[PDB]
Amino acid sequence: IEALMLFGSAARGESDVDLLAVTSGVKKTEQTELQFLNPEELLRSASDGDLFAIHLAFEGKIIFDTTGVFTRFKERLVIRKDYGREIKWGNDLAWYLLDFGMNANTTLVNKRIAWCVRTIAIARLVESGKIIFSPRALAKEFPRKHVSDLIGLRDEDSQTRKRRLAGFLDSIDSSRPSVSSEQEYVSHFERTENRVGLQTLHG
Amino acid sequence: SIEALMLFGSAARGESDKNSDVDLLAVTSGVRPFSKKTEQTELQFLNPEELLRSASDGDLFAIHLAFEGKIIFDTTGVFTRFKERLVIRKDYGREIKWGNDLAWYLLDFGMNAENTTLVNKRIAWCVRTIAIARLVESGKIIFSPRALAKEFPRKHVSDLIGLRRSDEDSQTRKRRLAGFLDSIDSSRPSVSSEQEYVSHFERTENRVGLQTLHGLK
Amino acid sequence: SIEALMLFGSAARGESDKNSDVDLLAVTSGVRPFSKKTEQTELQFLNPEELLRSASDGDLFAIHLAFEGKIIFDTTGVFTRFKERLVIRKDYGREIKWGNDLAWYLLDFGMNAENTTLVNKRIAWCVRTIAIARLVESGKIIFSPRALAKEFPRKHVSDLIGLRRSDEDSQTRKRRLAGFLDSIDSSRPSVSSEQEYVSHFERTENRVGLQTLHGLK
Amino acid sequence: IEALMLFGSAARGESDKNSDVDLLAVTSGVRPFSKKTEQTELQFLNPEELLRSASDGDLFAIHLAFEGKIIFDTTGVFTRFKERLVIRKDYGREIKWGNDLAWYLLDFGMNAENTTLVNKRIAWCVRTIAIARLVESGKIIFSPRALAKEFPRKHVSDLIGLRRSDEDSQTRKRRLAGFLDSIDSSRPSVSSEQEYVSHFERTENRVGLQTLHGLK
DNA sequence: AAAAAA
DNA sequence: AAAAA
DNA sequence: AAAA
Ligand SMILES: [Mn+2]
Ligand SMILES: [Mn+2]
Ligand SMILES: [Mn+2]
Ligand SMILES: [Mn+2]
């Protein structure tokens, strides 16, 4: 392991502990998340302006770095002109979770609703020039309908939170994709290369 | 009374030269901005309100702190509030014009000043400010001298940034700065005399330009 | 939930070689001690009461944490309270005896055990515990394998500590361990059989000896 | 500057009001000196002197080793520092230096012009005695609050609290005398200020000599 | 339920 | 040019 | 301040 970084909530001072380990030749406990990446993928995330890379660059705390990979990481970062692609992936998966998700692995569904909401909020705020990633600040700076409730779903309890997701979607004037069955969603996620929407759908 | 402390600059990046400074930012309430400098250390003091305001303004220096600063300690979370307040702008034309106008002043009146070290520091300030701003406008967050010269390859960028901690009084500095200004298609502001420059820096609120002149007297 | 996190071991020292692990200590309320391992990481959990007890008891591991550990975060000040409780002892004869007794067990009955990796790890533990304790007794705070071999230069110390990263059942380990034990003038405990060793470890409160017996199943 | 370390209260997470941020900068070719401001204190040392403080088991080096936070270290000097550290078996020399200076301050310093320096060095005497005796017992205590808890002699907290004070109260002398009595300190066999000076010279009490110099 | 890392 | 802790 |  050539470099180690603290990120997430523990890096902001406020509760999961998230650690990024960079290693060439490559997860979770009740309390910890240890994520591994090789240097090529770390730098690619910077070059492609991944929202996750923006978080690491502006909020990650370097524990050690023997090779200087985190400084090459930062000098490769290009914040993209727009994150419409990412916003659309979050919107589309949200509609799928609304239409066919409220009765699946309920743990994953709630985690994924929160992912949709956070992704849309992070992307719109990054577009406007912000570097906000914590749930608390996202809800303050992107005060759409039920944002606090939905981000808090990242929670294995199932109620009638279908109404909350629908309200959120209306307040950002989201349009459902032109799909009917769940099988239409599969081909839509495949066609739009919605990796998370695909990984989610089978789970 | 100092509620937070941050390492920034080359030492925060791990890329220190023989004659490189160690840059430290101390956040302490109830003071105006000032810096304590020794042989190899620069200690900058700022109060929290000024720090958060600089973030809200999208100051290029605030971006550097957010992107590269290493928090040594923070007892109040002020650096988290600082990052929440940051707004990276799309248009740094104001800061670019400030660096342009001061560069022209240094070209016209700086090359034979008594305080050679200040002129060189501020030539490099003009070039770095313009380079940093143009790259931020393109979605890049670049601050090291090496990457600035690579990513903003205008005429004499590397050797002019190299003047930042120099007492060189070479008469070639004029040609190099005029070459840089031509390569970015700079226009001299509608000014002639040194007093006219003062009013211009007053009128256009060029804080660093004003202080550079006061320093040179 | 984790109230504090600390880097320790080789990475905290800045001397991690090819086959190094990253060692992390998470201080977690309301858990008993346990660890989470990958090929390149070790994550140790302790609750605050147990962390402070190890300091009060002068555990050699606690000395390592206080002397070389790097605090990543500490929301409760538990590491400050830990260091205030530390009492470095003058006499580590108990621990030295625990290391000697377990080394004889492993020499006599460990060399063809199924769990070759655990045997090798615990041979290195015996040698390291003896070496660290003797050096602490002399006023030195030494934990790195390189410095332990230098400051406690007994037979095969470097080779045997290097077994902590080995799954190999080489025949050379028995001779080397015997050479080390001879070089410190060690003697077998009065234990007439392998089966009598669990009773001996029980009566002498050799926790690592008992745990090693448990894991060798 | 090849290495930089935070120490003192800020390294323990306790930097508050009226407390100073303490930084240690390692750089070549520099006699020990310190730059000080309202809220910071920047001590410079060369590598040879830093490692000597470890080899000699200086009480201050023990603080750096067990409580210092490394900000950066490009040469590994702090690792060679820690591997040189030898905690002495006895700190009687340091205890006597603090006792002797405390008596000098009691006898001749309680009315000096430089009240601030007297108060600072009273606290140094008390802190040095407390730290030294706790280190001899196997502890690594340096914060004022923990020193008063773990070395609970008479007035320890009041006297360490003089370290940032310009108080000239008459109570200081009686509190210092009480502290010295509670550790059964014996005053040096001197009868004059001139003889204190000769005593500090003979016993090589560098802080007692620097204090005397600074008071005049 | 679970260290024994250094 | 320490004496901080 | 104007450090980056
Ligand atoms: Mn979070
Ligand atoms: Mn720089
Ligand atoms: Mn090791
Ligand atoms: Mn203190």
Q: What is the DSSP string of B152-170?
A: S--TTHHHHHTTTT-----
In this structure, are D152 and D199 located in the same domain? yes
Contact in structure between D147 and D160 (CB atoms under 8 Å): yes
Q: Nearest Cα to B39, choosing from D44, C67, A161?
A: D44
CA-to-CA distance for C92 and C139, rounded, in angstroms?
A: 12
Query: DSSP class of residue B69?
Result: P
**Three-state DSSP class for residue D66:** helix
CA-to-CA distance for D132 and C83, rounded, in angstroms?
A: 16
> What is the CB neighbour count within 10 angstroms for residue B28?
18
Please state the φ and ψ torsions of residue C121, each to the nearest 5 degrees: -55, -40
CA angle D55, C86, C51 (to 5 degrees): 130
CA–centroid distance, A134 to ligand 1, in Å, is 5
Residues 170-209 of chain C with CB under 7 A from strand E are: 207-208
Integer angstrom CA distances of residue B61 from A64, B128, B130, B210, C153: 25, 11, 13, 18, 53
In this structure, are D122 and D182 located in the same domain? yes
CA-to-CA distance for D63 and D55, rounded, in angstroms?
A: 14
Strands C22-28 and C41-46: parallel
Query: Longest Cα pair distance anywhere in chain A, in angstroms?
Result: 52
CA-to-CA distance for A130 and A122, rounded, in angstroms?
A: 8
CA angle B136, B138, B140 (to 5 degrees): 55
| B72/D6 Cβ within 8 A | yes
Q: Which of D84, D102, D129 finishes a domain?
A: D84
In this structure, are A88 and A63 located in the same domain? no
Strands C70-74 and C2-8: antiparallel
Contact in structure between A5 and A37 (CB atoms under 8 Å): no
CA–centroid distance, A195 to ligand 3, in Å, is 41
CA-to-CA distance for D209 and D104, rounded, in angstroms?
A: 11
Give B22's contacts in chain D (Cβ within 8 Å).
Answer: 1, 4, 25
Please report, rounded to whole angstroms, the spatial distance between the CA atom of protein residue B22 and the C1' atom of nucleotide G4. 12
In this structure, are B101 and B189 located in the same domain? yes
Query: DSSP class of residue A78?
Result: B
Contact in structure between B159 and B176 (CB atoms under 8 Å): yes
Integer angstrom CA distances of residue A18 from A32, A90, B182: 6, 23, 49
What residue in C sits closest to D12 (Cα-Cα)?
Answer: C80
Give D1's contacts in chain B (Cβ within 8 Å).
Answer: 22, 40-41
In this structure, are D128 and D205 located in the same domain? yes
Q: Which strand G nucleotides have any atom less than 7 A from protein CB atoms?
A: 1-4
CA angle C2, C32, C52 (to 5 degrees): 70
Å from D62 to nearest chain B CA?
21
Residue among B5, B7, B22 whose CB faces D21 most closely: B5
| Spatial CB neighbours of C151, under 8 Å, sequence gap ≥ 6 | C131, C135, C140, C142
Contact in structure between D42 and D34 (CB atoms under 8 Å): yes
In this structure, are B98 and B51 located in the same domain? no
CA-to-CA distance for A51 and A34, rounded, in angstroms?
A: 19
* Strands of B2-8's sheet in order across: B34-37, B41-46, B22-28, B2-8, B70-74
Q: Which of A21, A45, A76 finishes a domain?
A: A76
Q: Nearest Cα to C28, choosing from C44, C41, C12, C42?
A: C44
In this structure, are D99 and D149 located in the same domain? yes
> How many helical (H) and strand (E) elements, i.e. helices and strands, does chain A have?
11, 4
Q: Hey, which residues does A64 pair with through a beta bridge?
A: A4
In this structure, are B198 and B115 located in the same domain? yes
Measured CA to C1', what is the nucleotide nearest C35?
Answer: E3
Contact in structure between A2 and A61 (CB atoms under 8 Å): no
Render the burial of B43-82: b for 16+ CB within 10 Å, e for the rest.
Answer: bbbbbbeebbebbeebbbebbbbbbbbbbbbbbeebbbeb
| D19/B26 Cβ within 8 A | no
The CATH number assigned to the domain holding B49 equals 3.30.460.10
CA-to-CA distance for D160 and D150, rounded, in angstroms?
A: 14
Please report, rounded to whole angstroms, the spatial distance between the CA atom of protein residue B207 and the C1' atom of nucleotide G2. 8
CA-to-CA distance for C96 and C133, rounded, in angstroms?
A: 7
Please state the φ and ψ torsions of residue D195, each to the nearest 5 degrees: -75, -30
In this structure, are B63 and B116 located in the same domain? no
Taking a contact as any Cβ pair under 8 Å apart, which residues of chain A between 36 and 55 contact chain B?
49
In one-letter notation, the amino acid at residue A123 is: A
Å from A33 to nearest chain C CA?
11
Contact in structure between B51 and B6 (CB atoms under 8 Å): no
What DSSP letter does each residue of D68-95 carry, written as one string? -EEEEESS-HHHHHHHH-B--S--HHHH
**Three-state DSSP class for residue C23:** strand
**Three-state DSSP class for residue C187:** coil
Render the burial of A118-150: b for 16+ CB within 10 Å, e for the rest.
Answer: bbbbbbbbbbeebbbbbbebbbeebebebbebb
Q: Residue B59 has which token pair? A: 């100051």
CA-to-CA distance for B62 and B87, rounded, in angstroms?
A: 10
In one-letter notation, the amino acid at residue C195 is: Q
Taking a contact as any Cβ pair under 8 Å apart, which residues of chain C between 87 and 126 contact chain D?
87-90
CA-to-CA distance for B12 and D10, rounded, in angstroms?
A: 19
Half-sphere exposure of B163 (CA within 13 A, CB side): 26
* Strand G reaches within 7 A of the B61 CB: yes
**Three-state DSSP class for residue B6:** strand
Q: Nearest Cα to C86, choosing from D140, A155, A157?
A: D140
Measured CA to C1', what is the nucleotide nearest C128?
Answer: E6
Q: Which strand E nucleotides have any atom less than 7 A from protein CB atoms?
A: 1-6
In this structure, are D36 and D73 located in the same domain? yes
Query: DSSP class of residue A28?
Result: B
CA-to-CA distance for D25 and B22, rounded, in angstroms?
A: 10
CA–centroid distance, B144 to ligand 2, in Å, is 5
In this structure, are A104 and A65 located in the same domain? no
CA-to-CA distance for C137 and C76, rounded, in angstroms?
A: 32
Give D139's contacts in chain C (Cβ within 8 Å).
Answer: 86-88
Query: DSSP class of residue A86?
Result: H
In total, how many domains does chain D have?
2
Resolution of the structure in the document, Å: 1.9
Contact in structure between C24 and C3 (CB atoms under 8 Å): no
Q: Hey, which residues does A4 pair with through a beta bridge?
A: A21, A64
Contact in structure between D169 and D182 (CB atoms under 8 Å): no
In this structure, are D17 and D73 located in the same domain? yes
Q: Tell me the residue range of the domain where D76 lies.
A: 3-84
User: At D114, which helix (H) or strand (E)?
Assistant: none
Q: Residue D51 has which token pair? A: 């490692």
CA angle B139, B141, B145 (to 5 degrees): 135
Q: What CA dihedral angle connects B83, B85, B91 and B93, to 10 degrees?
A: -90
Please state the φ and ψ torsions of residue D182, each to the nearest 5 degrees: -70, -20
Strands (E), D18-123: 21-26, 33-36, 40-45, 69-73
| A17/C26 Cβ within 8 A | yes
Measured CA to C1', what is the nucleotide nearest B127?
Answer: G4
Å from C209 to nearest chain D CA?
27
Q: Nearest Cα to B134, choosing from B124, B149, B156?
A: B149
What residue in B sits closest to A77 (Cα-Cα)?
Answer: B140
Measured CA to C1', what is the nucleotide nearest C33?
Answer: E3
Q: Which strand F nucleotides have any atom less than 7 A from protein CB atoms?
A: 1-5
With touching defined as 3 or more inter-chain CB pairs under 8 Å, the answer for chains B and C is no
CA-to-CA distance for C74 and D166, rounded, in angstroms?
A: 35
Contact in structure between D168 and D138 (CB atoms under 8 Å): no
Give C6's contacts in chain A (Cβ within 8 Å).
Answer: none
Contact in structure between B164 and B124 (CB atoms under 8 Å): yes
| C7/A64 Cβ within 8 A | yes
Give residue for tokens 């009065």. C190
CA angle D61, D62, D65 (to 5 degrees): 85
Give residue for tokens 């929160």. A114
Measured CA to C1', what is the nucleotide nearest B130?
Answer: G4
CA-to-CA distance for C183 and C195, rounded, in angstroms?
A: 27
Q: Nearest Cα to C207, choosing from C97, C107, C81, C117?
A: C97
Runs of H (alpha helix) within C45-189: 48-56, 60-68, 78-85, 93-109, 116-137, 145-151, 157-161, 172-183
Please check whether residue B29 touches D, CB under 8 A: no
Q: Hey, which residues does C45 pair with through a beta bridge?
A: C26, C34
| Spatial CB neighbours of D203, under 8 Å, sequence gap ≥ 6 | D96, D97, D100
Å from A24 to nearest chain B CA?
22
How buried is residue A178: exposed, middle or buried, by Cβ count under 10 Å (0-12/13-18/19+)?
A: exposed
**Can you say how many angstroms the Cα of residue D116 is from the centroid of all Cα atoms in its chain?**
15
CA-to-CA distance for A45 and A47, rounded, in angstroms?
A: 6
Taking a contact as any Cβ pair under 8 Å apart, which residues of chain C between 138 and 177 contact chain D?
138-142, 144, 147
| Spatial CB neighbours of D77, under 8 Å, sequence gap ≥ 6 | D2, D3, D26, D47, D50, D51
Q: Which of D37, D53, D84 finishes a domain?
A: D84
How buried is residue C203: exposed, middle or buried, by Cβ count under 10 Å (0-12/13-18/19+)?
A: exposed
What DSSP letter does each residue of A122-140 carry, written as one string? HHHHHHTT----SHHHHHH
Q: Hey, which residues does C5 pair with through a beta bridge?
A: C26, C73
> Phi/psi zone of residue C139: left (φ > 0), alpha (ψ -120 to 50 degrees), beta?
left
Contact in structure between D31 and D14 (CB atoms under 8 Å): no
Contact in structure between D8 and B2 (CB atoms under 8 Å): no
**Can you say how many angstroms the Cα of residue B44 is from the centroid of all Cα atoms in its chain?**
13
Give residue for tokens 């939905």. A150
